[PDB]
Symmetry: D2
Subunit: 376 residues, 4 copies
Amino acid sequence: AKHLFTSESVSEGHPDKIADQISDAVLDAILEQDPKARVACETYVKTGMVLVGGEITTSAWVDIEEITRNTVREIGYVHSDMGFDANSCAVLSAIGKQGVDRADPLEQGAGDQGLMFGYATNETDVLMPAPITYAHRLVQRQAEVRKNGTLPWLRPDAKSQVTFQYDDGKIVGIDAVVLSTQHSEEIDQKSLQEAVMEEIIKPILPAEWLTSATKFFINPTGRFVIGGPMGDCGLTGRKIIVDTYGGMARHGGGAFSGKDPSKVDRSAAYAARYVAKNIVAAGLADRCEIQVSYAIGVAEPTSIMVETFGTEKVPSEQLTLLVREFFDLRPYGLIQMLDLLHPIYKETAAYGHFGREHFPWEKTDKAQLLRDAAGL
Amino acid sequence: FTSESVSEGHPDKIADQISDAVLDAILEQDPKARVACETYVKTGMVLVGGEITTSAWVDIEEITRNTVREIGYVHSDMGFDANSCAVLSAIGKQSPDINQGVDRADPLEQGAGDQGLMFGYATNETDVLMPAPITYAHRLVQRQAEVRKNGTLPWLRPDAKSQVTFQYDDGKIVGIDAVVLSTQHSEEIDQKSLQEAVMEEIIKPILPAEWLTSATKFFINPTGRFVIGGPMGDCGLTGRKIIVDTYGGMARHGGGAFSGKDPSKVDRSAAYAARYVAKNIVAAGLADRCEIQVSYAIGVAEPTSIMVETFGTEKVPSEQLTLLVREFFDLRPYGLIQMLDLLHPIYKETAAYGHFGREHFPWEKTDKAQLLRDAAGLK
Amino acid sequence: AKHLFTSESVSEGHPDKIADQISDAVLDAILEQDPKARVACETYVKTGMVLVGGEITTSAWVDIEEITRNTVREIGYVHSDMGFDANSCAVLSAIGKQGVDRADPLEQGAGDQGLMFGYATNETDVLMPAPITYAHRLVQRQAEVRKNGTLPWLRPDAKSQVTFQYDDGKIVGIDAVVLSTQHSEEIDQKSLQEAVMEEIIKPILPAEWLTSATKFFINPTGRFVIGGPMGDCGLTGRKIIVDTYGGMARHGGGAFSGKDPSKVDRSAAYAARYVAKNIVAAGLADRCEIQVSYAIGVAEPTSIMVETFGTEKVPSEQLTLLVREFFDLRPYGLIQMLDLLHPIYKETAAYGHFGREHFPWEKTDKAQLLRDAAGL
Amino acid sequence: FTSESVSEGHPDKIADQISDAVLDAILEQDPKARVACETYVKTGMVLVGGEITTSAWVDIEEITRNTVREIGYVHSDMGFDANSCAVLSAIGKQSPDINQGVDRADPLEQGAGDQGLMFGYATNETDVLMPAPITYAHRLVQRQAEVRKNGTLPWLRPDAKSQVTFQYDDGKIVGIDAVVLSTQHSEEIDQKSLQEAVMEEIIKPILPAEWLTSATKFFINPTGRFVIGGPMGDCGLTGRKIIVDTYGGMARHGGGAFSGKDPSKVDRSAAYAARYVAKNIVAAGLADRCEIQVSYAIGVAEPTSIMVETFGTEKVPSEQLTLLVREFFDLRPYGLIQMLDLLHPIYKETAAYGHFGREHFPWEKTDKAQLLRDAAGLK
Ligand SMILES: O=c1ccn([C@@H]2O[C@H](COP(=O)(O)OP(=O)(O)NP(=O)(O)O)[C@@H](O)[C@H]2O)c(=O)[nH]1
Ligand SMILES: O=c1ccn([C@@H]2O[C@H](COP(=O)(O)OP(=O)(O)NP(=O)(O)O)[C@@H](O)[C@H]2O)c(=O)[nH]1
Ligand SMILES: [Mg+2]
Ligand SMILES: [Mg+2]
Ligand SMILES: [Mg+2]
Ligand SMILES: [Mg+2]
């Protein structure tokens, strides 16, 4: 049936995303020395200050301040005229804290309870829903043209939102686009709107989806000079829908950034994405949602549901069987299936954990095996 | 299907309750205040930050300690003490270049304060029109009023987590296939006497639903000793339980957190309105399950999208539903506030045991169902 | 006997003095609404952040953030290139907390124990010791030429130190001068030294005391661009010797800033200065040190010692008698004798609480009465 | 004359002990580390900030909690708990544009790291050559080792303050004219039984000095109930007891704080050397009372001033003393370090009950007195 669906994203400069990146920069720094470290790093950014807290247990020795300043600096906050300066902001630290419980580590019980969802759809090339996919690309393009000097008056903080029109489960076009970007005093709003349209929006959104009825809200309130942590708190794990599927799929409720792979909240979400994407990549369904749940201390998932919204190209009972045959969804089994014990997570902390074809859980190395195990 | 909840002693929930305690305190004096209160709780301290624009004069430390006493932290043995903990505040005033004054001759036409997407959901699986798993997870952890009325004080400590795994045949509840209840306790009780008291003293609200067949896996303290909890050895932030606050995974979510936000923040008020729309659609008999998505663009009063999903359970053409909602509900940001009468200090009660399913809240009223049913042409 | 004596001072931009000024700016803001408020405000300034804490009890409603930013801004830290920005630094608050115990408030017992010292000497016009006096004037002159644009490349943080040569208890000249000033990248060290000599040192130090043997250490280590809270913590009450007599006199050990006048640690120190200065101003002695001590809950001082280092012009027993006849040294008696219940204390928090002739405890309105009560 | 001291339970002293605990921990691994550790203690939290340049890897929280346990805060009833309090750190690394490497072919010729003035003092009023009032104020509050060895645990809480008021005739001790001892206590003792136990159980170190004539005013808990103390309801910062740390008001002070500073900070090492010079002058019989002032200019190795004050008690021309000190002591910043053997983790013990008067410290040695007396030509 005809309907609209909307998703949003934010740039690496949005204060919530700043916190997520700092949390995963600390995780990456620790994993490079202690691949098996336990990390639960919560970050809280506000005017003038970064607070890094949580609980950690590792043999690694890390400089929290240096990691934090480097991260903020890469994001681009390097001057008080931007509202935040990586070189002079305060950095505060408030981090704290059986061994071989299984003969086979792959049989360790879940370190926590919870349910996670994976999703895939052949709407886009990356098998992600269209709204979240192009919302990410808009804020990522904003950062791209900000850093390479194409538009030097841009500033780090920005938000996007895309409203897609669907009909009979197929995409007809784009109904509304929102893009709010921080900027310096130099540029006027008229010049800003045209440059964002020409350098950010038009190069990213397929023209076939842009009709005369599409609304374009470019800095709808106008002046956007004060941004980032100034005038807006940022906390880790406050963008979990931006991080996953933009609302197209359900969500178990767990945040990703700041957590080592032993947190099923994170790695099982990655594994769920890995199965759903391989099912859709194998031609076994157009759209596929995977629900997995874990009981603490239990290795086998307490539930595995495969929903294909009537788009399955083989019986539903055979899909759920293939999922069990080709994927190891035990907490520490999926860690090895995805090779998650490496410092690869700072890159996930902005622009979406799902959609980019270089992360382990985005590989489709099992798609050909799945359709072979089903016929075609 | 599986869904989980947490108690008022959980650190994340502590942060929500503090943020809404601060909000409620401000609304008592300035019902039109702008509040964005973000709370951080860690071993030994509370940090309350954010931005507020109000004429009210409140006491953040006093509000914070009172919130923590009620939750039941008044001694260092529990791992946290509301009387001796540290309370830091980092709250700024009016963010420059925002409040442009009147702006609109009709205040109901004001633009939204931010972009964003919100979801509402209703299902006639229960007399409160909520999804089954999440609904009784709250009532489970909420029966800790026994430890306040001295019904049974014993050994239980606040921090708790529930998980119920149902299974469906044709969208109908088959039964309970797995119950996970992990609770913090004291040293004055063993894991054997614990798991027996846990499986017995959780039945008074859980109803005579003997859905626990011979194939229902129970996990009461499956890991073992659970003595240290709360902020001690675990960090809590507001807005880190948004799936617990809403529909426990059954319905989708837009990502916005509720606590610490005044009603002019669409992230909260529009989620409430979405629940108000879906519950009234179901209550009116126009559908058995209903999910609503709204979205806003900053500075725009009209929602940029409205989607009504009935999952094939509608009793009237779906396009008709979308039109009924557009006219029978005022989904403009400041029309929601008037439609729900939201400018009141009612939000601390929400930050604890679910924002939906408790029918004394304005967005739980089904005062439009009959009107909707009449306009829909049924009967 | 011949000897050298040295004292130091710091500018309003030195991080310890930043904390003192913030503490007394909060005190002033409270006293303007609640003259009888109880204030004990401790401030802690570091890279990017100001922490204001302590214990207060008042009917006043004050905006700690606004008071703090205004204070830092007046000091001059307004840009991340200076290492600190009043507009974007973090401000954290950690403030907490019988009535009519006496029929006559003047008889209330001391709110705390302690001993305090006052000092006066006719060496200088303001009846202060020479070293501390001119150390203050150097850093105060540094700030004066920084703000009025005479030397716009100066920055707020600076330190001074003057070594005086004494002989037979009389001043012969100045043996060494140290002046370290923060500055921007623009100025080179050679140009900086000459400008500090011409605009700061020479206009302040009497030429009769500057001989060819006087050492001048102007930015002895050279480059001084990073200053203020960056690279150096500041805490309230860490300059108590700069605040009093530069070491020429003994010190009871109590800090001034952040305390309301009910803290004998502060107001009794002021009263002691008031008596010593009036004794010297009356011609009753060349140099005079006053020691007073208080027992908690006791109104009358538990000791009053008057030391005149052999310079007394009347018998010692008569000086101590005159002190008791003309000065009310009870805790709440000296408050009324000096009219201390007004927001006058932010001005004391840099450049010395003693020496400036507009504070109440620097008035010599009793000098003529003292010498009349003794003859001449 | 009057002088006061405080115990290791006083919040300011807690901050000093933490700063030197951190310093000592670093020196154990890097004896040449640069440390400037500033500690803030408030109800429920410790904030450890400053700057350090070291190759050592320490644990600030672990060091902090251990320091607070020893002081005796392990339960929320005392107002503070070392196991549940918050510990924040804000410690930066090498301040840019400072360490220029070698700089000098003879390391003893390095310039001072900062300007500043320092005082030392010695008097033969006591076998430790310290002023009377302050010397036994420390030993008073230090006898709280009874509450550690279970000698007498009872009701006393850490926070305590002493004050003794002597009087002089011709520089000779006449007697005690006023004793003020206010101590924090528990609810398991009244102010009557308190003041009796306070006046009786403080005599074991106070010696048979019955200087308490009929005119000696005693003030034991003169205000009354003293139950809440420590960081609870009172703020503590390092370097806020510098007169207690030194000579209790008898001698003058340069303003620099000791704790949290490594020996290359003249604010500490030169104050120690000043005490070393004065004590050796008195011990050698060259004077009965001696006060020394030194000062430094940043980047200059030679003190910018040295003043010897004998208060008329010298037994040799005063100008000769100033010359003897210049040659028999190396008062250059890095010569002090070698002269006193300061690159060792010995500083936490100083942050508690006075930096001077305890003869096992390097700066309390009188190993030059005889040499000084020989060079002075006496006997
Ligand atoms: O109560 C029960 C629950 C499950 N079972 C059976 O356990 C079987 C599952 O075996 P398994 O977990 O070892 O298979 P798996 O592929 O998931 N193993 P891996 O994850 O690839 O390592 C099921 O066939 C189920 O019928 C019972 O017999 N009784
Ligand atoms: O034990 C004692 C101590 C003091 N005294 C006497 O109290 C007298 C002090 O009186 P006072 O305190 O009222 O005089 P004052 O000028 O200080 N009063 P004010 O501070 O100006 O209000 C002294 O003369 C002293 O001899 C005793 O008789 N016995
Ligand atoms: Mg926020
Ligand atoms: Mg949002
Ligand atoms: Mg410092
Ligand atoms: Mg100093």
